[PDB]
Design a protein around this motif. Structure first.
Motif, mmCIF file in Angstrom:
data_model
loop_
_atom_site.group_PDB
_atom_site.id
_atom_site.type_symbol
_atom_site.label_atom_id
_atom_site.label_comp_id
_atom_site.label_asym_id
_atom_site.label_seq_id
_atom_site.Cartn_x
_atom_site.Cartn_y
_atom_site.Cartn_z
ATOM 1 N N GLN A 93 44.098 70.188 53.256
ATOM 2 C CA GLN A 93 43.745 68.889 53.819
ATOM 3 C C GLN A 93 42.284 68.464 53.690
ATOM 4 O O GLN A 93 41.985 67.268 53.700
ATOM 5 C CB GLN A 93 44.191 68.811 55.284
ATOM 6 C CG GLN A 93 45.708 68.873 55.432
ATOM 7 C CD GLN A 93 46.419 67.976 54.426
ATOM 8 O OE1 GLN A 93 46.356 66.747 54.514
ATOM 9 N NE2 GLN A 93 47.087 68.593 53.454
ATOM 10 N N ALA A 131 41.314 65.143 51.723
ATOM 11 C CA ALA A 131 40.479 64.167 52.429
ATOM 12 C C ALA A 131 39.332 63.722 51.521
ATOM 13 O O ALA A 131 38.981 62.542 51.479
ATOM 14 C CB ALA A 131 39.922 64.776 53.720
ATOM 15 N N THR A 132 38.753 64.672 50.794
ATOM 16 C CA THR A 132 37.666 64.370 49.870
ATOM 17 C C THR A 132 38.205 63.488 48.738
ATOM 18 O O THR A 132 37.650 62.427 48.456
ATOM 19 C CB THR A 132 37.056 65.663 49.266
ATOM 20 O OG1 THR A 132 38.072 66.399 48.580
ATOM 21 C CG2 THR A 132 36.490 66.544 50.363
ATOM 22 N N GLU A 146 40.656 61.487 48.631
ATOM 23 C CA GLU A 146 40.996 60.136 49.075
ATOM 24 C C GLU A 146 39.782 59.254 49.338
ATOM 25 O O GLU A 146 39.818 58.052 49.075
ATOM 26 C CB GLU A 146 41.895 60.202 50.323
ATOM 27 C CG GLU A 146 43.303 60.703 50.011
ATOM 28 C CD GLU A 146 44.160 60.904 51.250
ATOM 29 O OE1 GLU A 146 43.752 61.677 52.142
ATOM 30 O OE2 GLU A 146 45.250 60.298 51.328
ATOM 31 N N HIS A 147 38.704 59.846 49.851
ATOM 32 C CA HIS A 147 37.488 59.081 50.122
ATOM 33 C C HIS A 147 36.878 58.554 48.815
ATOM 34 O O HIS A 147 36.332 57.461 48.785
ATOM 35 C CB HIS A 147 36.458 59.947 50.859
ATOM 36 C CG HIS A 147 35.189 59.226 51.194
ATOM 37 N ND1 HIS A 147 35.153 58.133 52.031
ATOM 38 C CD2 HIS A 147 33.912 59.440 50.797
ATOM 39 C CE1 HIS A 147 33.907 57.701 52.134
ATOM 40 N NE2 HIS A 147 33.136 58.477 51.395
#
Lengths: 93, 93
Positions: free
Chosen positions: B12, B16-17, B19-20
């Motif tokens: 995750q 998360a990285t 997606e940013h």
């Protein structure tokens, strides 16, 4: 009125983390949140997290956010938490 | 049919990285990118990238994405890069 917060953040990686949290705690589905001190908070996402701008006691400006989780007891005890305190989020179903 | 990629991710924190980066690489936006090999490419995001599922050589499934950058004067020749190689993305260049 300027909104105060005990802590704020501006690093891209940090932002990345906060935005990912808003995504998981988005399907408003029962969860089990684990914080920095080892605390464990389980329940229903009652007020969804939204990232906003805040200032700290040292007057620094940055991002953070709050969400309210209502516990799973009969009287659904309300608990507001700061997003920076979160280190993990696993289901509940 | 499976699409294969050099590396894939399931944690995750890495998702998360990944997606940013998309949020900072909107279609047609001009940016300068920092890569994990010390290099950096600048140009125009040809098309907003998407995070997808792929298989590596050992046949394990995970997330990753492909980014295409085009330009004119820089170096000519469009370039494709796997997004797990990105360390930073800044606007204006």
């Amino acid at each position: 009125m300027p909104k105060y917060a005990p802590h704020v953040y501006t690093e891209q990686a940090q932002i990345a983390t906060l935005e990912h949290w808003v995504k998981l705690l988005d399907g408003q589905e029962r969860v089990r949140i684990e914080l920095d001190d080892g605390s464990m908070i389980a329940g229903t996402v009652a007020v969804r997290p939204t990232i906003q701008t805040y200032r700290d006691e040292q007057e620094r400006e940055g991002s953070n956010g709050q969400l309210r989780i209502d516990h799973l007891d009969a009287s659904q005890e309300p608990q507001w938490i700061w997003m920076d305190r979160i280190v993990a989020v696993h289901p509940m179903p």
